[PDB]
Amino acid sequence: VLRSVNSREPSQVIFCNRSPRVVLPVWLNFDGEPQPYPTLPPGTGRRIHSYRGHLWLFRDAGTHDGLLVNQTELFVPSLNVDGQPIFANITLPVYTLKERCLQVVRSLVKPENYRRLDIVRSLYEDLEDHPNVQKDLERLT
Amino acid sequence: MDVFLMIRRHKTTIFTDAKESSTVFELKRIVEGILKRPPDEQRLYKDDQLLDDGKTLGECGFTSQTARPQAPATVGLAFRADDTFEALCIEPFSSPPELPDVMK
Amino acid sequence: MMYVKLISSDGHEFIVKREHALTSGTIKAMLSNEVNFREIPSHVLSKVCMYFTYKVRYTNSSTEIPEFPIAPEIALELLMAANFLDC
């Protein structure tokens, strides 16, 4: 379902990381498999060659937390106007307080020890069920 | 520009915003609306410094880049009971417990 | 403006805009203008209120969004509160 269209029509794009995270760009290939691309450090940008109809999403490279691109989940390069590149502004979402707490707790506790935390089972499961691109693709389908 | 504040007295903490251009007195009017005490019965402070009614919040060091939504700046508050003002007293928040071992 | 009072387990009274407190469906339920939280101490509830301000300010906003900061020492309790408050 979610896959890039094989258009072969070039589209130049600026990946602009306006988040404080290290960004992993992910291209959804023609079979819908996520292909990881080189990372962007916080606040950096890359001019890259993509194609019209191609699908991209962006993650925290270390934790796979979700990020937004031009305020949404998916970025699809369009036709370049006047030879100008398309801007893909990558930003933090406003996470729910729960998700943000899960992030911080995940960053401090090794996964083997989530079960040692003194919290209800559902929260242990929430911690173990960490962000993952495949999970989101099924969701987005 | 908006500044984001905690106005604090004893065990009372008001979360609100105001304009950098707004005055200390105008902030007392905000406090008046909430806690029902007029400006003449309020003293506002930045740390230990008594704030003058006519000054802007900006002038008194509350700026949009220091008084942030996710980390608001503190304005101290003291009431006058009858003749004289109480001293500025802000009760600390509770202390977090020790980190569990698995978080170290 | 309509304000509500959120009171921590240790007796700290937090006064926030009603609209901000309704970020939490749990708080909405508890209101239908004060709510006492027997399990949420002030070092946690103060942060909850700061989250409300942060969320209202940066939701549907184009200006770059900063990270919501959470000290390691409060993260576990804040998580528990967030789960209760559903926010």
Ligand SMILES: Cc1ncsc1-c1ccc(CNC(=O)[C@@H]2C[C@@H](O)CN2C(=O)[C@@H](NC(=O)CO)C(C)(C)C)cc1
């Ligand atoms: C340097 C960099 N940093 C962060 S991402 C990145 C980077 C590096 C190389 C590229 C080279 N471009 C591609 O690989 C594009 C992106 C995507 O649209 C797919 N793609 C292709 O060139 C694909 N080609 C076509 O679709 C030809 O029609 C193949 C070769 C992967 C199949 C793009 C971004």
